[PDB]
Amino acid sequence: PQSTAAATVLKRAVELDSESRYPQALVCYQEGIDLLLQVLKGTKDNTKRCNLREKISKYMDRAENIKKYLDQEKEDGKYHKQIKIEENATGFSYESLFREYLNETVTEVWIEDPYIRHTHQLYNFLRFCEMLIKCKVKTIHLLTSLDEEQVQQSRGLQEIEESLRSHGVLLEVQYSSSIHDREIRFNNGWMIKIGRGLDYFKKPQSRFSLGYCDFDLRPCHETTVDIFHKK
């Protein structure tokens, strides 16, 4: 009866979110959340009371994140678009994802990803470099966290550096054990924050299952991708 109105507001909040109307979407989230609290503090049942916590805390996470980004426009950002990668979704190859935001003006790429250690992660980074050379990229700056098992990482990136150097592309790799924020930056203004980073792929089914070489057909983990501009 009263909680039914809370459903309509949150629905509009989601619509505005997808339509990239973030300032309006945020306000609707706050009202949708507030209405759920007036229901949560009213419900006596214990099973339903735990259902609302999930619903509220899920919405609250989204709302709080939007506010962070809108405050983050201090020269660093401009919440342009967010694309959700659903659990076990497809069509999210590194080419398909950065297709639009890549052009001839891009000559320098910054990447902060704390998870470029294991073998598959190295290849993920490798394919990321591959599509970055066809466009006009000169220098690539990588910042990843330090493993210690680090030989595969320290030598792996070293070989990729040498191979990129064979195409006249200079790779600069730096390590830091105290990083967490995933961040992609192009010198044209575009910036991309992926939840998992370059590791949103799950291992394939069989040795010759579809989506082993072309990651457009490869299923993905559930993650979020946020797009920004700097002008």
């Binding site: 706050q30 959340i33 507030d34 609290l37 949560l40 503090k41 805390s57 609250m60 709080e64 506010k67």
Partner: peptide, 14 residues
């Protein structure tokens, strides 16, 4: 729960 969530709503309208 009603104390954890209601406080987060204050951070939004802050």
């Amino acid at each position: 729960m009603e104390d954890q969530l209601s406080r987060r709503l204050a951070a939004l309208r802050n």
